[PDB]
Structure formats: structure tokens, C-alpha cells
């Protein structure tokens, strides 16, 4: 039977599951790892022990333990990345759709959900694998990871609690992967690793990291890059958070064994309601537990490791949307709010530099607030805002990932480069949040090929064009068809930086994205920032 | 007879000059001052003592000792600014121009050459006053000053070179023309002040100064103001640079008295000829004596002069050229020469903002660097030196005139602001200089109504409203006719900011002029210097 895999962790069962009008197998939460529980709370995830019989994998597995975003009840805009499955602890599984007939040895993708390391589903809608794997003859794999303090609550020194777990979690699905994806019809030489924002930065997580290099081919990251200010800590930061939890949930601190005692004894929503409560700053678009420059997992400071050529060398594909500030302005920001037009004053602009760019002295406010100041015109609210939804994305998402593509386009062996900025006319965001963090993924994932949900036939036209240039990236390393009508993605080059839009319009080359913002963020204000 | 004039220090007698095919009196070279030789070299001047008979004012004076640009011998464009009489350490003269018939009491301007106070001379073609004396009915003087260490080596503490002593020719000037202008027809009541470059500076220095202000009614800065970073230094740089100036003519350094009493053994030309040896950095736009910050000319720092309202309060009239900086770049920074286009590399560029900001640190340097590059296209020649031609004029002329302009508007009585931009047809210099540091002077003065010039009809009319603009605000305190068809010139306010710009096209209102560069020079630059 075409529904039964037999795999060297043992034999599981999938499901037919129905797909614009035909069908494909899907096995749905298959195991890669023993339950991390009881003591095993933030450890390092074990190997899962293999089982006879046959595994169900009809249905979606649990959600990790997360934090709830209840901003906006029964607004789908924000319910639609909450957990849809109920959560547990008991949450390390992966997801297969398998085209029909099953393939014998074909193009495999697997998938690193995004959530800021505090969050984050394998079984969102928007994630769902099917039509990627229907329409482009892939075996699509989606993983998950623990997050939050349970994936990346960090007390260096100690074998209890090290950090980085979500981040092995992650590892061991993919080490999974290469095991076992040649008994659905993967090619393990063939997988391609890719994810939006702290899936994305995962992703060049394990370009970076030795131990994860050698258990895929390429990768694709969305909105996301490895060495974005949010993704990591040192270990005394880390450190000093976790002993912060500690001291919220009442835990004797004279220890490592005291305090990691004391958090496991806790219900897994006590860690949760006090999470944010340990951020050293008033800050937005910054996250509690994430992973940590542990000289292990990452053997030097990311900046090194970047410079000396430290990382896998290979084909990455990569790229940002046009506002991916605005989220993040929404929650927290004063001025901004879900349904207005959001006009912001100088002042609540000046708050919002501040939230922005926790880690600034006042020069250093000041010099932010100048470069993203139209001086002709300073109390224009519009101006303000998009400014202010500028500065977010591009010190947090844009011009990190350009760091990192410019210090990887030295060693590597081809960069592909897009910035997506086409506006979906289904979203129920408000019109000032522009093309908004993550909501390329749908795109991605081939959401508007279902005429149900109301997408046009552009943006039909556009999700396909981007799933194949993707599906096509992962097979060969080059998103373009061999022999194509189409206009070319050009190849990213240090001497000349091309990129392309990625829209319902007709596709333009451009050079140098967003390079003067860039400058300022990735050369001027750090040198700034070390002198005073 | 109307060339006969008795004045309080004595009878003076002018010539007949034509002018325009008619003609008005012209009385050159009075004294005003004892001639400040043997002993009397740096000290303050003395008034010049009363003489019986008649003083021969039929010829213009001698020009005060200074430097004398060579760099392009035979070339009209540098030589029009040389000395064009004997040079003399006896040159306290003043000038002046009286209509025919003599008027009985009517509007006086006195013109106060530049030359960044070590260079200039009231007896230029280009300051030549018959034209607007003439076209606009007014007395026109224009005066002399001592330029260079004889004007302004500064060892502070001693009586017998205090510094300062060329802006005291300056006022005993002033003071001359305040008490016998009445008898040329002037009205002394009704005195405006006007100079460009260091005359600008040297007008708004006036304005400052306690001493100087009851001497004159209102004032017009060109392309000066006294807060520019050249145009004065402190009581201890005096001080190191008079020392210096000593120590390249072997003089004994042991005391004030042994200095002195050497630097004026020496002929005038020996301390001319070390002159530029004692500027303390590799720098375009500084000049080594120039007036110093002494507690007693200049009460307190200039800033806290212009935060308390420490001024002149009455009407100002002011602006700029739209390339400043050219001249300065052609005089010393590398790439730049007067026969090429002067297309600037990158490594160019970075010499260039290290010659235009010498007072900064590696960061100050790398902040003006991003200010002012386009980093979609930094190779550009023509941007690097267009890029280099305002951060020269932007530092040391238009921001601080704005800065200026904004604090006296404040506590002031009326200002009105222009940017000139009009090159004009005759120009010798090459186009890559734009509009030079200068060449608004001609205009002022009335050249282009001389058709042997070479100057257009359209010149000519700009010509004429320039004039009656400067006459007109002379005489009322605001440049516009009281009921004329022409648009208004509108007044200058904290809250709108407007300027006009003057051209030979329609003339149009604009708004904070260069606010964003001027916000970098004025505000963070300064804040960034202070803080490293
Ligand atoms: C594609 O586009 C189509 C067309 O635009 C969309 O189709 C429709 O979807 C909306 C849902 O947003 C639907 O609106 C409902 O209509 C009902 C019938 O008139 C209303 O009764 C209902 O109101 C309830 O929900 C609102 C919140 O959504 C509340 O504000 C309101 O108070 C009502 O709440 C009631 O709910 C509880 C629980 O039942 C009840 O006990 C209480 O009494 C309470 O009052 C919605 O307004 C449209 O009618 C649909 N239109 C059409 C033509 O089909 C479709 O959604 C789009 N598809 C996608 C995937 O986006
Ligand atoms: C990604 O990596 C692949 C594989 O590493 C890489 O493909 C290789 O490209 C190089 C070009 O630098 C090829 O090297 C050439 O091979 C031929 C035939 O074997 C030689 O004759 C060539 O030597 C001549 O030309 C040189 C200039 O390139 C001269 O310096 C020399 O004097 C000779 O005249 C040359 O060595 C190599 O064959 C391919 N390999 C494969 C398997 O295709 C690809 O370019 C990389 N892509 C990116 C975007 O980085
Ligand atoms: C495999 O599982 C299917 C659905 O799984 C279910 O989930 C658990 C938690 C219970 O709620 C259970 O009642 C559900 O059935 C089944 O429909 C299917 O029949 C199962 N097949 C086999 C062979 O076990
Ligand atoms: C969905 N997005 C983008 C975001 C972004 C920032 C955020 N910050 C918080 C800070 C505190 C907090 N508490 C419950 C204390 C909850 C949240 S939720 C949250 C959600
Ligand atoms: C006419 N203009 C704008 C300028 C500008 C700067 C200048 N710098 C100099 C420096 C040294 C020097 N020496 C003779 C040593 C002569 C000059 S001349 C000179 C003329």
C-alpha cells in the first residue's frame, strides 16, 4: 500500500489527503525524537526509540508549548499563526506530503516554522504542505522544535540546561530526514532547508553550524537571517535571563541545579505568563529565550564565523518583504493601532526609535532618528509612520540579511535574491501595515491556487511563479527553468547585488537593496555605538 | 562747490567720476585712522588726528599687506581679488561715493570687503560703488581693515596685541562715517552695514559686539556669518598660532614683550611669507588670524550671545551662494584643478572630507562620508565632487548662516533670506564650480549695467532688482516696495522659514533651506564630536 512506509525507526500509516481536485499522501506526526519531559524539560532531545507495530500518522501531532497571542480575539489576522492543535510538551514531530504515486527518488523541502523562538506551529493552514507538494513533484517535510524557555533556556556550563535545544531539535528532524526520506521518495542529497523570520534565521543556523551542514543540500531564507539582532544572546545574557525566570516563578538561585530543579517542577504556562517579564529593555521586535553563541553549537561570534568563510558553502535563495516592521509597531508602539490610519507625532515617533533600538545611547537614538527624518516636513504622520515601520524592518530583518548575504556571496557557490512586495487583496490587516511580515509564506505555500479563499488570478499567477521558482531552486540550485520564455532571476554578485520584485507586475531587475539604509545599520551605527 | 566737503576731522576733496553716461562725486582714500606702523603694528588704532587745509580724495588708497594669490597668474578670475594698489601697512582709508546733486540726508550703505581676513581691498572693479550709489540714490562708503597678523595675531592678556584689532579698524570706521557721513548728505541714522565672506562675518560680529552696535542702523550678510567655524578661534589657538608665527621667524619666545618687539623688526612681507605655517591641521577654508573669542570685543562665547538675545536687535537682510565650497576645493584638495571637470575618486572623496572637517575624529569623518554619498552609485565622479562642493559650503557657509539666521530671528526685528543661484554667462571659471563664493558681489554692485562687460539683458534686470532689493531694505528695513507689481520678497519667521531664491527666472518661495544637511552640521555632528 502506497499510505504504508516502512522506516528504520519502524513502520508508519499516512492518509490520503484530497488536493485541487486529485489526491496525495500525507503522513502526519511521525516522531523524531523521545518526549522531552519530566527531567528531560530543556535538554538535549534523545534519539526516539524504535517502534513495531504501525504508527498512525493520520493526524496532525500536538503544538509546543507556547505563549497565546490574544491582542485580537476572534480576529483571524493574528489567530491564524496561534497553535491550532492543543499543546504539550510532548510536541517533537514532522510532517510528510508525498506526491501520488509515490515518487522514487525526487526533490525534498523541509520546512522551519518562524515565531520569534517563542512560538510557532507545524500545523498552521497557511504551512499546509499539500499543494507545493502536488503542484511541484516534491516531498514536502515540515519539522518542529521546542520554543520559548523550553527550546532555549540557557545556563552555559551546565549539561541540564545548555541552550540551543530548539535548535538540536531541529537538527535531529533533519538528521531524520537524511535517514529516512528515501523510503517516501526523497532524495536525502537533494533536501533543501528553508524558513520565514526565526525560521529563516534557523535555517542559516545550520549553514553555520558544523554539526547540522552535512544533513542538507541547500537552503532558502525568507524575512530571516542567522546573525538578526533578535536571534541570539551571549551566554551571560542568556544566563541572566534564565536566573530572571527563576526569580518570577519564586526558585532558590544558589545553584544551576537549584534553579533548573525549581522550573521543572513548574506547570509549563507558569514559565509562559512570566516569559516576557526577563528582556533587559523596554523594547519591540525582541524575544526572551533565543539561541545562544555557545562556542558548541556556534563555535565563534557569528561576525567571525561570517569572515573567515566558518559555514556550509552552497546555493542559498533569500529575501525580505517591503514592510516588515509594521507587526511589530502594531504591538507595542504607542501611535499605532489595528484600525486606524496610524499617523504618528514626533514624540510618539522619538518613543518608537527608542523601542526600536534598545541597545543605543542617546547619539545613538539621535543618529537613527536623522537618517529616517524628512527634515522638509517633521510632523508629517504618514511620514513618521512609515519611517518608524522603516527603521524596524530594516535594522531587524532587511539590512541583517544583507550583511549576511554579502559575507556569504564571497565563499558561496550562488545566491538568488528577491524582495517581495505585492499587498494581498484578501488581507484583513489594515492598509498602513503594507506588505506584512509573513505573509509571503502563502505565496510560498500555494495558498491561492484555492479559489475558496478569495485570492485573484494574479496572485494565483504570482503563488505559482514563486513555488516553482523555489521548487526549482531546491532541485537544481538555480530557480530559473533551463530552457524558459521568462525573463531571468539574476545570480547575486558582489560587484554588481542584483535582485528581483516579486509581484503581480512584470518582474524588474534592481541592484544594491535598500544600501544606503544598510550602510548606516551594518557599518555606521555599530562603529558608533563602540566609540561612546 | 559740491566736491568741497568739510568734515569734523578736516576738508576733504573729491573727484567727478562718470557713471553710466552721467556722473556723481567720489571722495577716495580718507583717513580714519593714524596709519598703525613702527610701533603701532598689531596694536588698536588710533583716530586719525584732525589735519588743516585740504586732504587730496582724488585717488583710491593703498591696500592693506596681505597674501597674494599666484595659483593662476594672468588669470582674471583670481587675479580680480589681488591688490590692484601698492601694498602699505599706512592703508586705514575709507571711500565714498556721493550722488550729484549731493543729497541732504538720505540712506547710507558701508560695504566691508571679505577675503577670509587675511586678504582684501576696498578698491576692487567688482566693489567699485559709483553704479549703486548712482542707480539707487544712496552714499555709499566702503572701508578698510587690517587683514593677517597685522590685523589679528592675538597674544592675549598683553595691550600691545590684543587680537581683534582689524574688526576695531572696522568699527573706528563706522564711527568716522556716524559722525561725518551728515555732511556728504548721509543720513547717519539710517547706516547699513553689508560685506561678504569675512565682511559678512565681520557685519554679524558687529551685531554682536556691544561696541559696535550703536554705529549703524541695520545689516546685510553675504555668504558670511560671524558663528563660521573659520571665522574665529580661541584665546589659547591665538595665542599658539602668534607663537608659531614667532618660532618660523626665529624670534625669542620668552615673553609677550621679546614676541612682539621681534614681529616687528621684521618687513611686512617676512611675516606674510610663514603665514600659513601655523594653521594646526591639513585643512581647506581655514585662515590663520583671524578674530579671536576675548571676553571683551566678544563678551561671552558667540553660541551663548545668540541663545540670550546678546544682540543687535533690528533688521537683517542675508544669504548664500549655491556652491560655496568650489573655490576652497580648487585651492588645495586633491582631484580638483581649474581645466578639468574635476571628476572625484572614492579615495579623493575621503581626502577631501578629512580636509574640510580637520577638527573630527574617524567617526565625524565617517558620518559626513555617509551623509553625503550616494551609495546606489558611489564611484560617480561627478557625485563625489558635487557631493565634496556642498559638504564645503554647507559646513562652512550655509549651515552656519542658518544657524544664524534662526537664532536671530528669535529676538531680531525683521530678516529676510535669499539663496543666489544664477551663474552668470561671463563666467572664466569652468563649470564644475557652479555658483562660486563671490560672484552674488558683481550683482550687488551694479557691473552688468556696463554693457562693455559681456553681461545679458536678463543679467542686467537681475542686476537692477538686486540693488533695489539691498537699496530699498537700506532705506526701510524691507527689501520690497511698498506698492509695486513685482511678488513679494516675504519676510523670514521661526515658523514658516521662507526664502526667496534670486535668479534671472521668475523668482519663487522655497522653504528651510538645506534643513536636512544643516540639522547633521548644526545639531548631531557637533553632539557626536562632544561625545568620542
Ligand atoms: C471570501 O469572501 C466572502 C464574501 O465577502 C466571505 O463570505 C462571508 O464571510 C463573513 C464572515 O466574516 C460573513 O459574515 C457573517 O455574516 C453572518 C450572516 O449575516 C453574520 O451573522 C455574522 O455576524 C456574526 O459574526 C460577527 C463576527 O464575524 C459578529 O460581529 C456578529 O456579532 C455576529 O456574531 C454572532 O456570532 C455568534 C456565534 O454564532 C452568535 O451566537 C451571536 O448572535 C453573535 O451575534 C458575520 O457578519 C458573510 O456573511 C459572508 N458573506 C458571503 C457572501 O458569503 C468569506 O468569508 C471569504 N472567505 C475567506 C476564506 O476569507
Ligand atoms: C559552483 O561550484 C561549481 C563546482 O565547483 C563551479 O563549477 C566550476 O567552475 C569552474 C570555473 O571557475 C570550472 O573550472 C574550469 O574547468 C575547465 C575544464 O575542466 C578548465 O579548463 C578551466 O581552466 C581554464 O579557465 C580558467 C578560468 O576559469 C583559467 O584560469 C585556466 O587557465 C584555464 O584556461 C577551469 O578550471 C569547473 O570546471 C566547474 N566545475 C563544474 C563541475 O562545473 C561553479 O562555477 C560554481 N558556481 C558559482 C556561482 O560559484
Ligand atoms: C488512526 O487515527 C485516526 C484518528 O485518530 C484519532 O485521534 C485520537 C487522539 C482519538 O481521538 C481517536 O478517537 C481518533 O480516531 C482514526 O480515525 C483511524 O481510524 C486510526 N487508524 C488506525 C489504524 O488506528
Ligand atoms: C505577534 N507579535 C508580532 C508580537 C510582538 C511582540 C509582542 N510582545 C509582547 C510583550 C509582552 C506580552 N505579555 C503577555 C506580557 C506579550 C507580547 S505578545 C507580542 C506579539
Ligand atoms: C583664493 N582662495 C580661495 C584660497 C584658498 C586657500 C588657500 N590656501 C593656501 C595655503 C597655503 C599657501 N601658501 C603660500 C603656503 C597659500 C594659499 S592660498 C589660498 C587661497
Redesign the interface.
Same mark, same amino acid.
Given at each position: 500500500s502506497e499510505l504504508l512506509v516502512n522506516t528504520k525507526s519502524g513502520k508508519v500509516m499516512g492518509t490520503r489527503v484530497p488536493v485541487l481536485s486529485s489526491h496525495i499522501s500525507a503522513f502526519l506526526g511521525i516522531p523524531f525524537a523521545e518526549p522531552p519531559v519530566g527531567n528531560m524539560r530543556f535538554r538535549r532531545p534523545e534519539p526516539k526509540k524504535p517502534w513495531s507495530g504501525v504508527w498512525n500518522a493520520s493526524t496532525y501531532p500536538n503544538n509546543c508549548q507556547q505563549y497565546v497571542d490574544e491582542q485580537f480575539p476572534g480576529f483571524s489576522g493574528s489567530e491564524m499563526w496561534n497553535p491550532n492543535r492543543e499543546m504539550s510538551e510532548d510536541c517533537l514531530y514532522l510532517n510528510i506530503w508525498v506526491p501520488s504515486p509515490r515518487p522514487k527518488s525526487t526533490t525534498v523541502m523541509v520546512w522551519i516554522y518562524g515565531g520569534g523562538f517563542y512560538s510557532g506551529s507545524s500545523t498552521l493552514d497557511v504551512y499546509n504542505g499539500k499543494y507545493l507538494a502536488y503542484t511541484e513533484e516534491v516531498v514536502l517535510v515540515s519539522l518542529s522544535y521546542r520554543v520559548g524557555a523550553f527550546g532555549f533556556l540557557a545556563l552555559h556550563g551546565s549539561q541540564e540546561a545548555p541552550g540551543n535545544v530548539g535548535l538540536l531539535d531541529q537538527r535531529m528532524a533533519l538528521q531524520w530526514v537524511h535517514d529516512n526520506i528515501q523510503f517516501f521518495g526523497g532524495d536525502p542529497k537533494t533536501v533543501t532547508i528553508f524558513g520565514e523570520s526565526a525560521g529563516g534565521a534557523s535555517v542559516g543556523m545550520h549553514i553555520l553550524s558544523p554539526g547540522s551542514r552535512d544533513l542538507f543540500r541547500r537552503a532558502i531564507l525568507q524575512s530571516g537571517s542567522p546573525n538578526c539582532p533578535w536571534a541570539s544572546v551571549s551566554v551571560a545574557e542568556g544566563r541572566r535571563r534564565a536566573v530572571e525566570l527563576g526569580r518570577n516563578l519564586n526558585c532558590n538561585l544558589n545553584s544551576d541545579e537549584e534553579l533548573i530543579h525549581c522550573l521543572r517542577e513548574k506547570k509549563p504556562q507558569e514559565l509562559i505568563d512570566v516569559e516576557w517579564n526577563v528582556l533587559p529593555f523596554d523594547s519591540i521586535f525582541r524575544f526572551s529565550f533565543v539561541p545562544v553563541i555557545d562556542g558548541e553549537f556556534f563555535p565563534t561570534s557569528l561576525e567571525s564565523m561570517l569572515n573567515s568563510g566558518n559555514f556550509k558553502k552552497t546555493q542559498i535563495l533569500l529575501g525580505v518583504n517591503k514592510d516588515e516592521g509594521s507587526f511589530f509597531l502594531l504591538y507595542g508602539a504607542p501611535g499605532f493601532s489595528k484600525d486606524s490610519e496610524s499617523k504618528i507625532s514626533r514624540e510618539d515617533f522619538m518613543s518608537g526609535v527608542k523601542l526600536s533600538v534598545p541597545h543605543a545611547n542617546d547619539?545613538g537614538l $539621535?543618529?537613527v532618528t536623522?537618517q529616517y527624518t $524628512?527634515?522638509?516636513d517633521d510632523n508629517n504622520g504618514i511620514k513618521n509612520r512609515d519611517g518608524l515601520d522603516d527603521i524596524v524592518g530594516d535594522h531587524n530583518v532587511i539590512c541583517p540579511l544583507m550583511h549576511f548575504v554579502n559575507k556569504y556571496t564571497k565563499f558561496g557557490n550562488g545566491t538568488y535574491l528577491y524582495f517581495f512586495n505585492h499587498r494581498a487583496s484578501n488581507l484583513v490587516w489594515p492598509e498602513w501595515m503594507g506588505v506584512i511580515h509573513g505573509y509571503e509564506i502563502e505565496f510560498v505555500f500555494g495558498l491561492p491556487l484555492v479559489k475558496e479563499l478569495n485570492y485573484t488570478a494574479e496572485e494565483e499567477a504570482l503563488s505559482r511563479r514563486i513555488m516553482h521558482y523555489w521548487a526549482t531552486f531546491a532541485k537544481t540550485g538555480n530557480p530559473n527553468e533551463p530552457h524558459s520564455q521568462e525573463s531571468k532571476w539574476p545570480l547575486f554578485t558582489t560587484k554588481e547585488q542584483k535582485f528581483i520584485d516579486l509581484n503581480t507586475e512584470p518582474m524588474k531587475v534592481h541592484?544594491?537593496l535598500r544600501?544606503?539604509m544598510c550602510?548606516?545599520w551594518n557599518?555606521?551605527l555599530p562603529?558608533?555605538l563602540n566609540?561612546?
Open positions: 547619539l $539621535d543618529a536623522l $524628512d527634515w522638509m541592484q544594491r544600501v544606503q550602510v548606516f557599518q555606521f562603529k558608533l566609540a561612546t
